[PDB]
Amino acid sequence: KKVLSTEEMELYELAQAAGGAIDPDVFKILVDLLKLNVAPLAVFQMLKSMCAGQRL
Amino acid sequence: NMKDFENQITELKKENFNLKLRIYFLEERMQQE
Amino acid sequence: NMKDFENQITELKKENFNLKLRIYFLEERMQQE
Amino acid sequence: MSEFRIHHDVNELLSLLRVHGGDGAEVYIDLLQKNRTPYVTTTVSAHSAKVKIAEFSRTPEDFLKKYDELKSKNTRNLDPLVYLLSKLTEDKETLQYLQQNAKERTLQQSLELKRKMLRDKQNKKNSGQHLPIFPAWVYERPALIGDFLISAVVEDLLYVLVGVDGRYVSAQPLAGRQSRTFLVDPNLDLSIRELVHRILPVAASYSAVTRFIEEKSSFEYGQVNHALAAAMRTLVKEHLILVSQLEQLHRQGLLSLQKLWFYIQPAMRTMDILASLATSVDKGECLGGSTLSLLHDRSFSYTGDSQAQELCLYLTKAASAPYFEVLEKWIYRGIIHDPYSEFMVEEHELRKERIQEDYNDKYWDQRYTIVQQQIPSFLQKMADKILSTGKYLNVVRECGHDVTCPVAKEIIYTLKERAYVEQIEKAFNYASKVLLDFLMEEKELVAHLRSIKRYFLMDQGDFFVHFMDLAEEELRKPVEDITPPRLEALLELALRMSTANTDPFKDDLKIDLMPHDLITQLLRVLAIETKQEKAMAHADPTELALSGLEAFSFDYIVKWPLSLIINRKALTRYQMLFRHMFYCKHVERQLCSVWISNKTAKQHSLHSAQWFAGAFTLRQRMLNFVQNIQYYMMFEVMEPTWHILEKNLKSASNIDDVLGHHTGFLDTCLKDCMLTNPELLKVFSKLMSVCVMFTNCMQKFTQSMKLDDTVQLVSGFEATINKFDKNFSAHLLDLLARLSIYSTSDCEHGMASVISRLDFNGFYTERLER
Amino acid sequence: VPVFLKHIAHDIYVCGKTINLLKLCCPRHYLCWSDVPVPRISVIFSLEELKEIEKDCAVYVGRMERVARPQVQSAADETAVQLSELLTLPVLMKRSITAPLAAHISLVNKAAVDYFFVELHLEAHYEALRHFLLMEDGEFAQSLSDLLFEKLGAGQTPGELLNPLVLNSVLSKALQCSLHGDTPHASNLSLALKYLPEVFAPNAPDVLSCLELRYKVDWPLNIVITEGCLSKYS
């Protein structure tokens, strides 16, 4: 939680209320990517590509 | 042809990426010192 | 296609060389400090 | 933020996601950057995204409540985050994988805020300008604040409408930053009590607005918040007029509770909107551009309420005036007049003088920075034009050009017409033009560039001939044995000796002795991020005392503001070009000296002429080779890239275009001179070293013959020449083969020109086929 | 899509997509960068108000072309519903909305046509396709055919015949022999390989089908000149 800023912490609490248990460092990096005005659809496609190769 | 140009471009893009990451880390180190 | 692949390869090579030069001068500076 | 922050963030994400192999990180970076827009142009339907997450959320009520909370705070990236969460909820597999990776992996507060803002503004104002502070009595006197001092019901509501507790309707104490609550006498009629509770919202909104007005009117809240508080105060005054009219009607007996409720409906709505705006400004701590962004989003949110939209437009226009006044000052004068750090552009003290020493354009980029948070949403699209405009005027101002924007007009916030956007673009274009003209006319960019061509590109062949004639003996010494005085004097002789003495900028030409030879330097640079990096780092620096011939480069002194264009990165590229041409000329001079020495050897002994024929043919292959390499470098790389630069410099629209054209020129000359290919460069270096060794051997043999077992000496010389010929031919065939390879696999059409020049007579063609 | 807009929903969608595309690809196009005010789209239920809205839309359209180059809102008022009594609510809404909508769509379409012709040089792209891809340089085509048939009849393999050095030499010779080979339109031609045959099959008419001439289309022309179109041309 110290990795996330207060706004990022509030977004993390919102994401938890959304049912997303996300790592605060991952959420922090995601917020930084969002701060760079990257389109969220491209970020979603990136996340999907990064996750698709990692079989549980 | 086209696949060989694509392969050369891919290697050059990998080198460019690694250079940018090393530059990023170099700038962060020079900013920390 | 082929001319576009040629341009992409040429640009990527130029960018990688410029990044390598910047790295080289950064390393020389970090070696001087 | 660092230019490569996305690469660090991607690398961290790859590490955190345990993605095996950095192979493809460039592809993810390219996907995000190609789809990265500098402006939040995607109007995402956050309502539907919220709905999707609430259907997806295990706690949908909490999600919606948190969304409305963050929106009331104007929390950045809220809608993007909700959209990201909705997309992760759409990708159940990705969400499960991410879950598994995660598992594996108020008065006192206001006084503190005022003190913090004062401290922050003083810290930003190194110039010791203390931000203005209101006297303590302004905040301590409760009767001044205008909030509730912690027929009869009509009288109390008419008092309550003025923020005064009534006799049957009394205001409750404000708990924190909450709206004022009221207590109504329980013995009132239920319908009367309910109508009072319906009207009391007006008094609660008034009390909230008055607290907001009194808090945000503090200097620490910045000029935009002060102007907003004054505009709200005007509407509260109109409300007090309305309430005084309802009181006057009540004294006339014309106000019933139902008549009050009907007549207060507009006032109730206005005060509710004002209280919502006050609460949103106070929760978001909005200042400067963030306040204008919030006002714009609220004005858009009121698209269905013409009265609410007109009110929000009035408030936004009033609050944008000081920020737009700062923007006007920036775009017309290159002046940031932001006492509270509310403007989108922040100034940093950077030393201009270090621009010539620092390879990075630190002064140009870091002196004036955009405060992204302080960019008003209506100015978000123009923040960069505003930045460039103020940068250009300040650069012009720093060159002693007073930039007065002739198109300077007051900037007013408008919702439908983006007149401020066109005005900022016009100011940017004017400032850009003024800066470009200052650099071209006052800083004589083209004259400095012509001087650089004359010296760094060896355009003045007579200059280089004179310089190398005067300096050859001194430069042949080890760098440690070279007297710098002799090189400076030979430079001055060459400057005075060449037609460059008519160059007014000839004194900017200097001699530079490079710490490394050009070939080792270029191979180290090209080995960066290559498999050769370790080999160059472990390559012991050869104990060969670097000769002045291998260390010689030019430097060029560029004064401010011209040091912005002819920076150290440009000068170092010019030095590389100079050293390359000087080395080519050295090899040519050695091949000609060997030619002359052989012609002299042919004159002293008729019988030795047969033994000299092979050395002559080796020298001739080396000379034709060296001359064709020099010709390529001079007339197809350096000359074409200079002509392209001069044409592009002629087409430049701003100083950044001139800088871009000069960098592209240098990069083109560097590319076309084969300096960017480490294998070709290494073969050329070996070829030139073999050529120099051959010329030195031939010179020694000719000197020995002139001063003069002899048959043994001649057979040894011929064997040495044949070994040099074999080595030269092998390196030349490897060069031609590499040029052919790059020409076919890498589409480096320029490499075919090198091959055609190198094998113009087909001498290597059969050997290349072999 | 609203049922009353269904007859115009597709045109509205295409207009909005086109406006976003023009802004994304060529935001400074005179058609794309014109500050000309776009006609207002609003529902009108008065026949007088509807005619006034149509007239204002027409005036706006005319002004924009030059630059590029009631319902229920009063009380005593009765005309505000006169159209609503004369016309049915769906027909009234259609008449009220589509006229300004059609005016704005038509203005957008005209500006898009102008942008494509002047800024995207679609005609120039077709001319380039004719010059290079259609073998309009007859000399280049003749030299290419003779060299190709010499290589095919000699049994050169694709690795030998379709080698980038060999292909580039053939292209350079054909362009040098063509009167149009040095034209900038010919420069958009590129010879690519679809596949590398091990051996040139003798007497096969499809022997040279591995060769492809590609045409590059930049944004926004690559929306119209699609990769499928370039593939069919190839």
From TrEMBL, chains B, C:
It is found in: Cytoplasm, Cytoskeleton, Microtubule organizing center, Centrosome; Golgi apparatus. This is CDK5 regulatory subunit-associated protein 2. The gene is CDK5RAP2. The chain holds residues 59 to 91 of 1663 of the full protein.
TrEMBL record, chain E:
It is found in: Cytoplasm, Cytoskeleton, Microtubule organizing center, Centrosome. The chain holds residues 584 to 1617 of 1811 of the full protein. It comes from Homo sapiens (Human). The gene is TUBGCP6. This is Gamma-tubulin complex component 6. Belongs to the TUBGCP family. Component of the gamma-tubulin ring complex (gTuRC) consisting of TUBGCP2, TUBGCP3, TUBGCP4, TUBGCP5 and TUBGCP6 and gamma-tubulin TUBG1 or TUBG2. TUBGCP2, TUBGCP3, TUBGCP4, TUBGCP5 and TUBGCP6 assemble in a 5:5:2:1:1 stoichiometry; each is associated with a gamma-tubulin, thereby arranging 14 gamma-tubulins in a helical manner. Gamma-tubulin at the first position is blocked by TUBGCP3 at the last position, allowing 13 protafilaments to grow into a microtubule. Component of the gamma-tubulin ring complex (gTuRC) which mediates microtubule nucleation. The gTuRC regulates the minus-end nucleation of alpha-beta tubulin heterodimers that grow into microtubule protafilaments, a critical step in centrosome duplication and spindle formation.
